[PDB]
Design an enzyme around this catalytic site. Sequence first.
Site, PDB file in Angstrom:
ATOM      1  N   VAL A   1     -11.385   8.664  16.664  1.00 19.93           N
ATOM      2  CA  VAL A   1     -10.009   9.174  16.624  1.00 19.93           C
ATOM      3  C   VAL A   1     -10.030  10.558  17.237  1.00 19.93           C
ATOM      4  O   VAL A   1     -10.804  11.408  16.812  1.00 19.93           O
ATOM      5  CB  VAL A   1      -9.475   9.257  15.189  1.00 19.93           C
TER       6      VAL A   1
ATOM      7  N   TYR B   1      -5.017   9.840  18.937  1.00 19.98           N
ATOM      8  CA  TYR B   1      -5.182   8.482  19.444  1.00 19.98           C
ATOM      9  C   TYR B   1      -6.470   7.884  18.918  1.00 19.98           C
ATOM     10  O   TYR B   1      -7.458   8.590  18.698  1.00 19.98           O
ATOM     11  CB  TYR B   1      -4.942   8.398  20.948  1.00 19.98           C
TER      12      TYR B   1
ATOM     13  N   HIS C   1      -6.023   8.614  33.194  1.00 19.91           N
ATOM     14  CA  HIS C   1      -7.424   8.416  32.840  1.00 19.91           C
ATOM     15  C   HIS C   1      -7.642   6.955  32.475  1.00 19.91           C
ATOM     16  O   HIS C   1      -6.727   6.278  31.974  1.00 19.91           O
ATOM     17  CB  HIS C   1      -7.745   9.220  31.592  1.00 19.91           C
TER      18      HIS C   1
ATOM     19  N   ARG D   1      -1.924  15.294  31.074  1.00 12.38           N
ATOM     20  CA  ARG D   1      -3.282  14.789  30.880  1.00 12.38           C
ATOM     21  C   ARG D   1      -3.314  13.373  31.432  1.00 12.38           C
ATOM     22  O   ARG D   1      -2.588  12.482  30.940  1.00 12.38           O
ATOM     23  CB  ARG D   1      -3.701  14.805  29.403  1.00 12.38           C
TER      24      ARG D   1
ATOM     25  N   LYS E   1     -10.220  19.185  36.865  1.00 15.91           N
ATOM     26  CA  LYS E   1     -10.619  17.806  37.109  1.00 15.91           C
ATOM     27  C   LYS E   1      -9.442  16.907  37.492  1.00 15.91           C
ATOM     28  O   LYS E   1      -9.609  16.031  38.338  1.00 15.91           O
ATOM     29  CB  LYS E   1     -11.429  17.238  35.939  1.00 15.91           C
TER      30      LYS E   1
END
EC number: 5.1.3.13
Lengths: 200, 200
Positions: free
Chosen positions: A48, A131, A62, A59, A167
Amino acid sequence: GTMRPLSVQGAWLSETRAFADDRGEFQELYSARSLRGALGYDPGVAQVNRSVSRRGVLRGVHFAQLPPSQAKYVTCLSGAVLDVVVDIRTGSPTYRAWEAVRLDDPHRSLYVEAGLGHSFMALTDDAVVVYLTSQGYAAGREHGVHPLDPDLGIAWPDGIEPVLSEKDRQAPGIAEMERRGLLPDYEECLAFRRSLCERG
Amino acid sequence: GTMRPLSVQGAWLSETRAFADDRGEFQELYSARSLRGALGYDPGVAQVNRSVSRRGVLRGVHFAQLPPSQAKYVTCLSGAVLDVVVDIRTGSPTYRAWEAVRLDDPHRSLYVEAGLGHSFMALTDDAVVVYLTSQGYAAGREHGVHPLDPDLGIAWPDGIEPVLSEKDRQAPGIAEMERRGLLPDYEECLAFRRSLCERG
Ligand SMILES: [Ca+2]
Ligand SMILES: [Ca+2]
């Protein structure tokens, strides 16, 4: 509580119930039994994670290499984010499609199965997202597609300047990742989902 | 991140690391790999619950019937609570002992294995606690001991009037539950922990 599919196959919206009284509220934010009923499998919780994000922090996009990739159950616990699931799966009927969901209440959660791309932007300062993931984060298996790629054409919120990490800023576009063989294959994703349903 | 035992065997404190930068923070709030390293087993996540509590609300002392009972990983995401683990296990060397942990930061979590009693009091208005449990909540398997029982003698916070639910107010004391055979047995708890370590 309900769990229903979104427009990209593999993405789901979970709406969970609050039991409220004079003392506060109880909520069942995640139910493995509910997920197994909807999906055919229990994704399991290996980790988590919690992320706090300044306003306009974006963000994504990904994804973890398949297999086993990572399935994600995402909830914004405080503040609001705009979450965008992206169909990064080559050969998918909806390859390059995306769908935005506003996560602005703890009673709404998004489930993203293994093999899809996930992203969000913080709409409020210090938005908190929690998450659950089916596999532990591993930087070596983690990949990224640039979230502002016009080949995806995501409609990020009007009036908020995106703030990307180094990144994410230097991340390749979807067409580069595609031709370099770094995106998941849709039939491999489908076969992986079937494998999870057969475990036992 | 660390996971270390508390004074009641079966209760653990997890301190998790924040990776912070100009964009916010990332935290690994729960790691199955870390838990398996410390405990010998992965408890699994059957449910994630979230509870919002008014100031002075005292939830507890609750436990699920063993087996399989419920193991709980508890974190206060916002505000502060005082969490109290109680050794409700008959035959335990520390039967009726308790330990209080202040959960006032998202980077501290408490793990309570199956067979212990758990409670907390909200120190701030609208404190939010999230907890992962190894088994789904079932009202029929759920039991309670009165949190203000002088036979336990828990040191609840000075200066805050406790607010109990009807069910917690009418809850029996530990000595009544003991003689009615409604508390877990310590050797059954130990054997259950060994069974989890042997699964496979
Ligand atoms: Ca809201
Ligand atoms: Ca604090």
